[PDB]
Structures are given as structure tokens and as C-alpha cells.
């Protein structure tokens, strides 16, 4: 089993200008807690961990 990794304003939420830890990889969640916009894609449609 696994759980959250962390939580804060934004201290360790960045390190590389581009790659696997940039505004692009971070914004992935920016629209996950609000989901204001959509582009024919969802976290459930892609993967299906079934709450693991």
C-alpha cells in the first residue's frame, strides 16, 4: 500500500527547468483538484489503480 508523498506551499515542488519536474509536470495536478478545463483526457481513463 502507498499514500501521499508530501504537502506544502511549494518548496520541493520544483528542481529542473524542464524534464520530469517542471511547470508542465507540476501543472498536471493544477487541473486535478479543480478540473476547470479539459482536453479529452482523464486520470481514470488513462490508468486504473483502483485506489491503491
UniProtKB/Swiss-Prot annotation:
Top-rank taxon: Eukaryota
Entry coiled-coil feature ranges: none
Residues with PTM Tyrosine amide: 52
Disulphide bonds in the chain: 16-21
Chain positions of site Required for CALCRL receptor interaction: 22, 31
Protein task: ADM function is mediated by the CALCRL-RAMP2 and CALCRL-RAMP3 receptor complexes with ADM showing the highest potency for the CALCRL-RAMP2 complex.
Protein name per the record: Adrenomedullin
